[PDB]
Design a protein around this ligand. Structure first.
Ligand code: ACO
Length: 215
């Protein structure tokens, strides 16, 4: 438990208490997240939510509590050099649906960045999701949760954190934290096999920008 304001506390998410975490994500992460907001239907598929929750046992997911409620959350987990092949196979299994479209894009980015080979590190702590209650945006709750993930990464011996900023607001935040931009993929440039634009999110979100932080 880490007091980050006079009223907000950062806590680790435990394996038994994920329902309130998912309730928060479904209210304040998924509806505005550009990949989710740019594919149909608006609601995330079961496999999507299940993937996020599958990171909880790693002890790498954190929430911010205000008055006994979650007002922010970050979901992160490890990856290594097999992640590009694994994402590519996940994308083709879910091909045809919303989660398949999201994975289509995330797999293109993972294959392009390939951070473990790129930077000669054995593993990476990847941030999968970051969300802040709209009433508490502007208070660098996002930044404090990112720093918490980085400290957890250091304890775990990771030499690198990576993050795909699908949102301009996430990219601006990690820029403030000194992350290094390593890849940019504009949504208009990312097509499916039939030549159709996969993700069509609202402006101002024009690209997914992947950043890394050396630990
Ligand atoms: C790896 C990933 O998760 S990528 C996708 C990231 N998450 C999402 O898209 C869900 C959208 N949810 C959000 O919770 C937020 O926009 C976040 C977490 C990305 C950033 O929130 P914060 O940490 O509070 O942003 P930050 O502190 O840097 O700046 C917030 C303030 O409101 C703004 N702002 C932040 N987010 C938004 C937003 N989604 N829409 C409009 N304005 C925003 C400014 O950046 C800044 O304005 P101010 O100085 O005039 O007050």
């Amino acid at each position: 438990a880490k007091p980050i304001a006079d009223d907000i506390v950062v806590r680790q998410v435990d394996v038994g208490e994920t329902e309130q975490l998912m309730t928060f994500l479904l209210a304040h992460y998924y509806p505005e997240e550009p990949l989710t907001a740019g594919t149909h239907p608006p609601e995330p598929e079961a496999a999507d939510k299940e993937f996020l929750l599958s990171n909880v046992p790693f002890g790498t997911c954190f929430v911010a509590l205000h008055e006994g409620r979650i007002v922010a959350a970050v979901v992160a987990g490890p990856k290594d050099s097999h992640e590009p092949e694994h994402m590519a196979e996940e994308a083709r299994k879910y091909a045809g649906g919303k989660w398949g479209s999201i994975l289509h894009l995330l797999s293109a980015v993972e294959t392009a960045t390939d951070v473990c080979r790129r930077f000669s590190v054995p593993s990476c702590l990847h941030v999968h999701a970051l969300g802040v209650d709209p009433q508490l945006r502007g208070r660098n709750l996002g930044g404090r949760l990112m720093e918490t993930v980085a400290q957890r990464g250091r304890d775990l011996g990771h030499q690198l954190v990576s993050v795909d900023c699908t949102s301009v607001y996430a990219a601006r935040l990690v820029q403030r934290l000194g992350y290094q931009l390593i890849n940019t993929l504009r949504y208009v440039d990312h097509l499916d096999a039939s030549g159709q634009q996969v993700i069509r999110p609202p402006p101002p979100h024009e690209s997914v920008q992947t950043f890394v932080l050396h630990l």
